[PDB]
Amino acid sequence: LPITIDHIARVEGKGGVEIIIGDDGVKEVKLNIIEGPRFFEAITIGKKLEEALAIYPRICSFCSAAHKLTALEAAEKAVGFVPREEIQALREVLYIGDMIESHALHLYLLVLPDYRGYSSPLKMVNEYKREIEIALKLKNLGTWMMDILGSRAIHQENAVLGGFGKLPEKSVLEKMKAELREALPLAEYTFELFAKLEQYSEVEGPITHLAVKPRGDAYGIYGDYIKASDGEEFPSEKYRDYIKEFVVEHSFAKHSHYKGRPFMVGAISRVINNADLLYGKAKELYEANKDLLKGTNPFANNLAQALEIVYFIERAIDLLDEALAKWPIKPRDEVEIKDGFGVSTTEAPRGILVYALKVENGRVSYADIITPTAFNLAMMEEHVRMMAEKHYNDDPERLKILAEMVVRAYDPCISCSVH
C-alpha cells in the first residue's frame, strides 16, 4: 500500500509523490518527475550561438530571465567578450526583476494557501484583501521591470549578446527607483507575515547548503566561487569536480550529490553562506531573526525569500544609481564570436544555475545545464521522508498535506529540472 500524490498542485511543472510503506514504517519516498524531457542540451548543439541563446529561456517561465542572463554570461565568457559596468548593472536589475516576481508568486500564490486553509490563492481573494493587494503590487513591480528592460516578463528578447537591443529613456529608470522604494514597506510587511509561520519540527535536522559566492562586496547573483556551508569553496568552472549528477528510474530529472550526499540550494542556502554580505533593512531583519533563519529546516526557505525581496528592492535602487551615472548608455556592443569556453554560475531564485557553453565556428558544440531544483530534488526526497515518517499512520489526506507543504518550501520549478 504505497501512498501516491499523482499531480502536485501549486508547483511549476508535472510531478508526483509516492511513499512506499512497510512493516518497519516508511521505507521510501519517490518524487516522480514526469515532465517530459525537451533535450535543450542536445538540440542546441550545432545551431548558431544566437539562435540557441534565444531558446534557452523556454526552459522555464518563472526563472526565464535567469536562464537568458546566465547563458549570456557563459557565451560572453566563451567568446571572451566581457560586458561593460553599466550593462552588467542593468543586467543584475533585470535579474532582480525576476527575483521579485518569482518570490512574490511563490510566497503568496503557492505557499500561503496551505497555512490559511485554502486550496487556491484565487479563493482567498475576499478574506485576505490586504494581503493579496500586496501580493499583486510586489509581483507587478517585478513584472514591470522585466517588461521595461527585458521586453516581456516571460522570455526576454531584449537581453542579447553584447548588452540590450534598446534601453529605456532615463525618466523610466527614475520612475523605477520610485516604484522600487515604494515597494520596500510592502516587502517588509511580507517578511513579517512569513516570520510568524510554522517551521514544522518534523523536518528539523542537518542540511548542506551551497550558494554562489558573490563577486564584489554585496549579497548578489553573480560570482565565480561556489561556497558550501561545511566551510568549503570551489571554483565555478570545476562544478563538475565537486558535484555529481545521476539518473534514477523514477524521474526525468537528474539528482546531484556534493561529497556523495544530498544538499539544498536556494534562498536559505544563500542566507547561510552569505548573510554577512547583506545591508540595508535586510541586515537588521537578519540580525533580529537569526533564530528563524537556521540551516536546519527547509521551511526557513520561505522566510528567506521574503528577506531577499527586501534586500533586492534596496539593492536595485543602488544598481540603477550606478547605471544612471554612466548616462547616456549605448545599449549594446559588438561581440566577436571568437571560439572559447565559458562557464557561468548565477543564483536563480531557486538556487544555483550553471550554464556551460562551448563555441566552435560561431556554433554551439557543447552545452551543459543544471537548474537549482535539479540540485535540490535529492534533499527534497529526504525531507519528505522525515515528514512521512512522523505521519504514515495519521490520516492519509493529512499526510498528503504536509508532504506537499515540504515540497512547496523548496519552490520547485520542475520544468527547470528537466531541461
Add this chain to the structure above:
Amino acid sequence: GKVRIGFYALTSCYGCQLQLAMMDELLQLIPNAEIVCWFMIDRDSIEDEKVDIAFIEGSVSTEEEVELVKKIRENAKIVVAVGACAVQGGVQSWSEKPLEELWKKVYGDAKVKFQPKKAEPVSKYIKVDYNIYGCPPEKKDFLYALGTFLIGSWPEDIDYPVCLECRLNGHPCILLEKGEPCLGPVTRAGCNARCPGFGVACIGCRGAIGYDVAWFDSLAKVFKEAGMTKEEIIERMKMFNGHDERVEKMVAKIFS
C-alpha cells in the same frame, strides 16, 4: 449553470499558464465561468471531470501525454491548443534528430520508468478546435478568446504578418536598415511588433504564416542583398515550426 473551464499541462515551460495566472482581475473577467482543473493554482482540481472549454499547454512529449490528450478531447466540448508548444510542438520541436540519439546525448545509457516521445503538437493526436498563438501569447490573446467564448460567439485568428503591426508603430525595419534576419514577414501579428520595437528581429514565436502578399517591394531582393540564403531562412523558421511541412515551400516561393 457556469461555464466549466479547465487548463491542462503537457510538456511546457508553464509560461502560457503563468500569463493567464498573472492577469490580475482574472476572476472578475470570467464571471460566467468556474475553473474546475488547473493544478498549478488549485489543490482541488480533478482531471477526469468533463468541461465546456479545455485549455491545453505544451507539446505531447510522453506516452502518458498521448493517452491524456485523448482523454481531454473525450471529456471536453471545445479543445483550445494554447501556445507555440501545443500549437506547433514548440522550440523543443526543431531538431529532427531521432529520440534515441537525443536520449543518448543527454542521459547517457541510463533509463527512466516513463516513456519519452519526440516533441509533437496536440493536433497530431486529437482534433483541436481553436489555437491561441505565441510564446508566450499576449494577455489580450486570452482576453479576446475567453471573452468571445463566454458570450457564445467563436473567436478568429489574425492572419497577417507582424510587419503591418511594425509599420503602424513606426518602428525602423531592422531587416532593411540593419540586415537582421527578421521573421516578421512570415510570422502572424498580435504582439504589437514587440521585438522589432526593441531593435531585435522577430524569431517567429507566433507561428509561420503564408507570404501571399507583396508586403516588400522585393523581399527576395532584400533577403539576397543582406545575405540570407533560402536554407538560412528555413532553419530560423524551424525554431518554432519544426513540424510545418509548408515552411519549406513558402520560403522557396519567396525566393522565386
